[PDB]
Amino acid sequence: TLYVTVFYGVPAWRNATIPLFCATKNRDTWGTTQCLPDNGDYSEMALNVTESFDAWNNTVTEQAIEDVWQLFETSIKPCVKLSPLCITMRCNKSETDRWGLTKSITTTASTTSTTASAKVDMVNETSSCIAQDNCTGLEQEQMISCKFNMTGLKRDKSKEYNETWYSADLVCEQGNNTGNESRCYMNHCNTSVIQESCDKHYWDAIRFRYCAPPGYALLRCNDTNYSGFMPKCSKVVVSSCTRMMETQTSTWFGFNGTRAENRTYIYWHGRDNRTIISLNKYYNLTMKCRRPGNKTVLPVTIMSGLVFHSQPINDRPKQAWCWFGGKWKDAIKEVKQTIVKHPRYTGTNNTDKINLTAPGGGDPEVTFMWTNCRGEFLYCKMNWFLNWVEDRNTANQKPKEQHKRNYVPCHIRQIINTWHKVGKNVYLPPREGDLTCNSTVTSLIANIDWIDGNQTNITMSAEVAELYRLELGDYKLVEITPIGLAPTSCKRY
């Protein structure tokens, strides 16, 4: 009686695992070469369907992470290799001893001072201490002047050059230098070859959106209860392309997020306690970073004919530093409250027993905060900041860490181990002139870890990749498979 019949144009789908197209507005380099132009269509329609969503186990977020990484690699790939520079350099001894790269026992320093010296120092836009880069506690940058012998395309002739390195970028040979001119090499050369990131990478913003190929569609949760993992999402919105994503990579805090809303959200990985806490834009949280001093950049042509950008500064500038503005104290109170009320949390409901904290260990990739300020990476020690925002009773943190300030000291590092799971080292060319960056702060990257109903530790994390799961995350990609079967009485002829 009932025949299978096959219906075509059927409104049904299944999970897809395919590549998405990138589309952009910035077509100066990578956009023209790799991406579709942004179609400009940001409309969406809702369906009366229920669907399962999961930010961590997603193909949409997985591609965002991998694609940002690959566009970085294809940009640096053809740049000059700096293995010709892995030679002994002749560095000023006072500087290598002073900042700890080399050792000396002839300094015989002895200091007596007051220990009851903690201060509270606030800064804002209307202040001369910012304009002059001189706030209480800010020391010098720690740049070391080194000379070296380099050969260009003439081969049988060579010249001596002036390079001033950040102390973070050198190793320096130690022991029995009873004169001057210490012997130094780059921090990560010998186990590998350092490549220069010459094609203006990170000097501007990279923003793009993803588009489904024909026959595929993106579904999105449009709830307020989406916490990263949601088995039954009742508000499912359909679109052909995602929202525009900011491919920014910083640890501890994320900056310039697209998911900026007048609400605090916390995505929790369903199987773990790693979370991405958005911040409430209501408080206009912002970070203003400054790199004082006027740099000179000197191109050097080396053997292969490719150019390296040297840094002959010959000066002693103040440290790079970052200034935090906006209502930070209140934004943090909301984060703690949001955690307390969150469905996956069964810890303390006392907000005075919930604290922000740095990860431990001596590893700079987790103990600092890395901000890319227009091409230069700026690691910042944040104890002054944390003590302030928490209104912490410092008391026993040792004399230079006991202060409450809304700014932190930071140092520039030119040889940066990259963020993806590669371990690769690249060199970041210097920027000419000075640098200033004014970014919004949109998210906090942290784990929530408690073992009792007192002390919850929101532990700052350095997994930069987690940020992409806040930018997207709520998207699912599906395949439209519009062939259906259904028993009916209508046998052919």
Binding site: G9, T32, P37, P214
Partner: protein, 142 residues
């Protein structure tokens, strides 16, 4: 694009507007956007068109757009439908235990309950067409 396939979702099995023509137009949209971008890339990069990962990803989606289109037309032809709105068959439904509620269940819910049969049905529909071709051949000989 248009996504009329999703626009009618949730309307139940006794569905309206099964937009058959939607597949032809989704193919056209695919071809136009990819072709325009490939013509655009050479303005700055003429060599590394497929020789850099972005172009292997974009070629794969272009070739695939052609192949997906053809898989559906070929399957439909394999089942006897030059054009398929419903294109009725001669193959009976596997059992009475799996009957849709035309006025309650949706196509998404329904299809996910019969994936099992789709694997066995595809073969049966093809077998029915093979016998029909044999019957036509005998009529041609007569």
């Amino acid at each position: 694009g248009f996504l009329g396939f999703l626009a009618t979702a949730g309307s139940a099995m006794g569905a309206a507007s099964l937009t058959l023509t939607a597949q032809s137009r989704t193919l056209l949209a695919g071809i136009v956007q990819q072709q325009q971008q490939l013509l655009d890339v050479p303005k700055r990069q003429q060599e590394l068109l497929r020789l850099t990962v972005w172009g292997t990803k974009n070629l794969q989606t272009r070739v695939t757009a052609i192949e997906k289109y053809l898989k559906d037309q070929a399957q439909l032809n394999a089942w006897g439908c030059a054009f398929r709105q419903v294109c009725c068959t001669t193959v009976p439904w596997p059992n009475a235990s799996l009957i849709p509620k035309w006025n309650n269940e949706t196509w998404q819910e329904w299809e996910r309950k019969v994936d099992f049969l789709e694997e066995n049905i595809t073969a049966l529909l093809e077998e029915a067409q093979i016998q029909q071709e044999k019957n036509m051949y005998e009529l041609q000989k007569l």
